[PDB]
Design a protein around this ligand. Structure first.
Ligand code: ADP
Ligand code: ADP
Ligand code: MG
Ligand code: MG
Lengths: 418, 418
C-alpha cells in the first residue's frame, strides 16, 4: 500500500492488520515501530510500496522524508534519500517528495526512495528551475483576508471584532500580544476556522510550540488544515527543528505561487527554545538572552511578505506578556516593531468575562488603505474616533453590544452612521 | 509462604518466626536480610513460595521485581527475572507481576521467578494485547473528581474551598504553588482522604521526594493507598529511580482502562534530583540547571492526561516558591504554563493562621465548563465576581466564615443567592 494511508489509520486497525497479515505481536510498542514492521513484512513480498514526505537535509548531506502526521518527528519509518538524488534533482530542505520506496537492504535501517514521481505537487523536471524565495521582491499587503462569516453566531462576533480592530491581508507579519488566560487559543482557533471557510485556496499551517498534549489534540481535531505541534515535554531542539521544517516547507510552497498562512502559537516559546539551543557567545543581556540567539527567531518571523511574482506568506504569531519571567519581557521588547500590525489582548477585559478581550485603543494595523476600500475604511476611522475617548473595557462592552443586535459589518456601519 | 505478606509483618514478629523456625542472629540485621533468610529456610524446607512485585528492567536485559513496601529499594529479597521471561511475555518496566518463585541456585544470589500467573492483575495472555500508553490520544478532563465530603467537619472546609477554587477532574495536570510552612502537606493529606472516601475505584499513589522520615511514616499511616517515598538521606539516583518506577507503574495501570491519581510532594525536588543525576551538556542556565536535566521532569509532569479510549492519569504536584533558592525559582519559571490547573497558597494568609491559606484570585483551572454543570458554573462565576475586589487574606477569611455556616456547597450557594 501507500505509506500515507497506512500511517493515518488508527492504532487498533494497524494492530489487527499486522496480526492477520503475518506479524505476531504489535500491541506493546510505538506506532512508528508498527508501521516499520508492517512495511518491512509487506516489502519482502516484492509489491511496490509508495510513500511521501517533507525533506529534511542533515549536515552530512543525506536527507530524510518526515511525515506531517508524526509532526515531523524522526522515526524508524522515515524514508532515507542519498545525496545522489539531491544532486540529480535540485532539492532543498522542506521540499515535499512523493514516489515509490524500496525495502531496506543489509547495512541500512531506513527505507530508501526508488524513484521520485512528484516534487512539490508537480513534475521534478518542472520544479527544479523555480526561482528561490529570497530572490522575490517583497511588497506591502494589498489583498485583504476577510474573517466575516455571516452566520451570526458568537464566533462570527469575535471575527467581526477582529476585522474592525485590524484588517488582515496576505503577506503581513501580524503579531498578537496577550497575557496568560486571556483567550488567545480561542482567538487562534476562530481565525483558523475563518481562514478555512472564507479562503479555501490558501494553505493553512498551524504551528504550536511548547503546548500541552490535550491542546494539541483539540487543535488537530478542530482545524481543517495542517497542524504540527511540539509538546512541552520534548527538548528544545525538537521545537527548533519543527519550526525550521515548517518555515522551509512554507518557503517551498510559496515559491510555487501559493498563499501560505502560518499561525504560530508562541514566538516567545520559539525564542526561548532558540536561546536554549544556540551555543553561548559570551554575551548575556537582561534575562540571559543572546542577540545571536534571537537572530534565528527574528529570521523566522521576517520571512512573511507579499511576492510580486505570485503567492504570499502571512505569519501571525502570538507573544506572552506579564507572565512573571523576565525572558518573555525582553523577548517582547526586542519584538516590538518587527510586525506590520499588532493586536493586544487585555487581562482586565478577560477577568470581566467579556470576550473577545481585545484592547481596541492599543490594537491596530498600519498601511490598511491598501487592504480595504475607501468608504469602509472611513467608517473604520470614525468608529476609531468614537471608541478613542472612552475606557477600553467600556469600549469593548459597547462593541459587543453594537455588534450583537446587527448581523454583518456593513449593517453595523450603516446603523452607526445614521 | 507468600512473600508480600511476609514483607508486611513487623520486624519483631519476623524475628520470632525465624527463631522458632530454626534461625539465629536475626535481630541485628536489616528487615530485607531477615526476609531473605526466612525465605531461603522455608525454600529448603520444600514448599512453594508465591511472590509479586513491580518489574524494573536493567540495561543488561534482565529485570527485578521490586516491592512497594520498601519503596522499590533494591535489596536481597528482590525476585530476578531472566530475559527469556521478559521475551515470552513482552513485559515493560512498571508491570506488576505475580507468580511462583524458586530458591536461588549456585552462582546466583537472588530468588528467581518460576511461573508467572498474573500480569497487571490480569492473565498473562490478555496483558500482551494492551495498547502502549504513548499511542493513546489525550483529552481534556471532563469527569469531575468531587472533593467535598459533606460530613460538616472542619477538615472538610479545605476540601470545600478546593471545590470552589480549582475543580479537579480525572486526567488533570494540577500544580500547587506554595511557600514553605504554608500548609501544603496537610492539603495533600486532605486531598488524599477525600479521594479515598469519594472515589474508592481510582488508584491512589502518593509519591514523596526528598522527604523527612517522620513525614513518610505519617503519610503511610494516614493515606489509604500506596505511599512510596525517598527520604533526604538518600542519593539523587534513588529519587530519580523511584519517580521512574511510579510513573511507569501508573502508565501500565492506565493502559488497562484504570484511572490513577498521583500526588507529587515536590516537582522542585524531583527537578533537583534530575539536575544532579543528569550529566552536563555544556550549557548551564541560571541557578545551575541544565535544559536536558529538566527534560525528564517535564516528561513526568506531561504524562498526565485523560485517555479517550478509557482510563486517566491525574497528577497533582506541589511546587516550591519563596524558598530563597534561585534553582527553585528557575524550575518554577520553567514549569509555569505546563499545568491545566493551579492552586496558589499564600504565605501571608498562613502567617495570620487562616487555613487553608489559599490565594483564591490566582488559583483556577482551564476548561472548567467540562467539569461542572451550567448552574454550578454560574454560581462559581458570581462568587468569583464577589471575591475578586477584596484582598487575598480578607477574601479567604470571608469565604471561610461563609462556608462554616452551611453543610454542603449547595447550601452556601443558596445562601449567597438570596
Ligand atoms: N471568544 C470567547 N467566547 C467565550 N469564551 C472565551 C472566548 N475566548 C476565551 N474564552 C474563555 O477563555 C477560556 C480559555 O482561554 P484560552 O483560549 O485557553 O486562553 P489562553 O490560550 O491564552 O490560555 C475558556 O474557559 C473560555 O471560557
Ligand atoms: N487545614 C489546616 N488546618 C489547621 N492547620 C493547618 C492547616 N494546614 C496547615 N496547617 C498548619 O500549618 C503547619 C505546617 O503545615 P505543613 O503541613 O507542615 O505544610 P508544609 O509541608 O508546607 O510545611 C501545621 O503545623 C499546621 O498546624
Ligand atoms: Mg492557550
Ligand atoms: Mg511538608
Amino acid at each position: 500500500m501507500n505509506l500515507t494511508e497506512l500511517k493515518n489509520t488508527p492504532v487498533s486497525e494497524l494492530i489487527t492488520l499486522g496480526e492477520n497479515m503475518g506479524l505476531e505481536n504489535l500491541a506493546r510498542m510505538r506506532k512508528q515501530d508498527i508501521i516499520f514492521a508492517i512495511l518491512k513484512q509487506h516489502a519482502k513480498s516484492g509489491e511496490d510500496i509508495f510513500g511521501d514526505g517533507v525533506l529534511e537535509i542533515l549536515q552530512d548531506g543525506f536527507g530524510f522524508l518526515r511525515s506531517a502526521d508524526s509532526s515531523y518527528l524522526a522515526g524508524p519509518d522515515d524514508i532515507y534519500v542519498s545525496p545522489s538524488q539531491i544532486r540529480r534533482f535540485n532539492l532543498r530542505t522542506g521540499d515535499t517528495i512523493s514516489g515509490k520506496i524500496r525495502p531496506p537492504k543489509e547495512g541500512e535501517r531506513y527505507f530508501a526512495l526508488l524513484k521520485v514521481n512528484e516534487v512539490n505537487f508537480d513534475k521534478p523536471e518542472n520544479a527544479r528551475n523555480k526561482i528561490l524565495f529570497e530572490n522575490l521582491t517583497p511588497l506591502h499587503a494589498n489583498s485583504r483576508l476577510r474573517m466575516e462569516r455571516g452566520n451570526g453566531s458568537t464566533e462570527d462576533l469575535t471575527a467581526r471584532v477582529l476585522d474592525l480592530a485590524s484588517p488582515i491581508g496576505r503577506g503581513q507579519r501580524g503579531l498578537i500580544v496577550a497575557p496568560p488566560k486571556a483567550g488567545k487559543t480561542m482567538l487562534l482557533q476562530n481565525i483558523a476556522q475563518s481562514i478555512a471557510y472564507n479562503h479555501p485556496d490558501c494553505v493553512l499551517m498551524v504551528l504550536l510550540i511548547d503546548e500541552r498534549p490535550e491542546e494539541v489534540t483539540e487543535m488537530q481535531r478542530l482545524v481543517k488544515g495542517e497542524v504540527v505541534a511540539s509538546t512541552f515535554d520534548e527538548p528544545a531542539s525538537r521545537h527548533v527543528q519543527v519550526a525550521e521544517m515548517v518555515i522551509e516547507k512554507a518557503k517551498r510552497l510559496v515559491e510555487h505561487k501559493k498563499d501560505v498562512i502560518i499561525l504560530l502559537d508562541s514566538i516567545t516559546r520559539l525564542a526561548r527554545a532558540y536561546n536554549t539551543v544556540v551555543p553561548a557567545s559570551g554575551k548575556v543581556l537582561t534575562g540571559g538572552v543572546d542577540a545571536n540567539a534571537l537572530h534565528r527567531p527574528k529570521r523566522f518571523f521576517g520571512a512573511a511578505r507579499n511576492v510580486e511574482e505570485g503567492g504570499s506568506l502571512t505569519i501571525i504569531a502570538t507573544a506572552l506578556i506579564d507572565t512573571g519571567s523576565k525572558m518573555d519581557e525582553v523577548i517582547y521588547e526586542e519584538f516590538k516593531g518587527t510586525g506590520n500590525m499588532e493586536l493586544h489582548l487585555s487581562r482586565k477585559i478577560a477577568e470581566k468575562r467579556v470576550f473577545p478581550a481585545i484592547d481596541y485603543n492599543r490594537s491596530g494595523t498600519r498601511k490598511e488603505e491598501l487592504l480595504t476600500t475607501q468608504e469602509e475604511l472611513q467608517k473604520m476611522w470614525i468608529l476609531r474616533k468614537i471608541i478613542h475617548p472612552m475606557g477600553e473595557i467600556d469600549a469593548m462592552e459597547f462593541l459587543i453590544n453594537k455588534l450583537a443586535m446587527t448581523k454583518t459589518n456593513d449593517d453595523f456601519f450603516e446603523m452607526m452612521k445614521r
